[PDB]
Design a protein around this nucleic acid. Structure first.
Length: 270
DNA sequence: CGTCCA
DNA sequence: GTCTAC
DNA sequence: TAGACCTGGACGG
């Protein structure tokens, strides 16, 4: 999951929980090495917001819900396989590692953090990760300026395809988005990051770090769209013009992550 | 069955 | 896609 | 900074 998937998850939680009321403990699977979430309430509402590759849940108790309590905020990072699901209480998925339960009247549901590979993390109390830059979806101008102000950082010594994954400067961009963005401009993946951007002190690279993830958000789906699960997959796959597509060049970057591209790999390639 | 990949 | 122990 | 952290699915003999 990258920025778009975090954004769409945030929307899913707000649409799906708008008319729900949760109660009880926040239950966590025995196996999760993540922290227990110390929050019980007889009645409370879950809302969400996204920032790049992070999602913040707020647990907001209702007036007179016992015990008297302030709202609690968690922040989630999805890793490679993190998702939210609203599932009947009796049919929890495999790999449901954090669960919020509906209070009664009506059907016993469960909002689950489902994470097959358990790479996802949650932190108590609400703060975005110190160091992550502005969201490419929701803070374009702050994101765009944060980069152009700091091209003298060592991160931009790296090749462009490597720098595009630096969450200090491209919060929300992941492996598929760097493939899609660089393909749209035909920027060789192993051009020096600084050289590609020095030009910018017809959509440029930084517009596309925003407009391309936004194309994904507006397409919808990706586990959230009320579509048949593997229907969402087909549409997204149809959208991809470069990433793991037949007849595309492919290399490992200095961290051993597959960058996909057309034509010239660029001056700094293994 | 069993590696290779995300 | 980190995150932390090299 | 590069590998350890994980599971299920796709491909192959």
């Amino acid at each position: 999951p990258e920025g778009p998937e975090l954004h769409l998850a945030s929307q899913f939680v707000n649409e799906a929980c708008r008319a729900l009321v949760f109660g009880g403990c926040v239950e966590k699977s025995s196996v999760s090495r993540n922290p227990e979430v110390p929050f019980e309430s007889s009645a409370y509402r879950i809302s969400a917001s996204a920032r790049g590759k992070e999602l913040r849940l707020i647990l907001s108790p209702l007036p007179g819900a016992q015990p008297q309590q302030e709202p609690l905020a968690l922040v989630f990072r999805f890793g490679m396989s993190g998702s939210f699901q609203l599932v009947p209480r009796e049919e929890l998925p495999r790999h449901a590692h954090l669960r919020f339960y509906t209070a009664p009247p009506g059907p016993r549901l469960a909002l689950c953090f489902v994470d097959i590979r358990r790479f996802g993390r949650w932190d108590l109390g609400g703060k975005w990760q110190p160091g992550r830059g502005p969201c490419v979806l929701q803070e374009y101008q702050q994101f765009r300026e944060n980069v152009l102000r700091n091209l003298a950082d060592k991160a931009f010594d790296r090749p462009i395809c490597e720098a595009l994954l630096d969450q200090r400067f491209f919060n929300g961009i992941g492996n598929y988005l760097r493939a899609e963005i660089l393909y749209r401009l035909k920027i060789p993946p192993f051009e020096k990051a600084r050289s590609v951007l020095e030009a910018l002190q017809n959509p440029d690279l930084l517009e596309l770090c925003h407009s391309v993830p936004k194309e994904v958000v507006q397409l919808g789906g990706k586990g959230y769209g009320s579509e048949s699960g593997e229907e969402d997959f087909a549409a997204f796959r149809a959208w991809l013009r470069c990433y793991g597509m037949p007849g595309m060049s492919s290399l490992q970057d200095r961290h051993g992550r597959t960058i996909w591209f057309q034509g010239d790999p660029g001056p700094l390639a293994p």
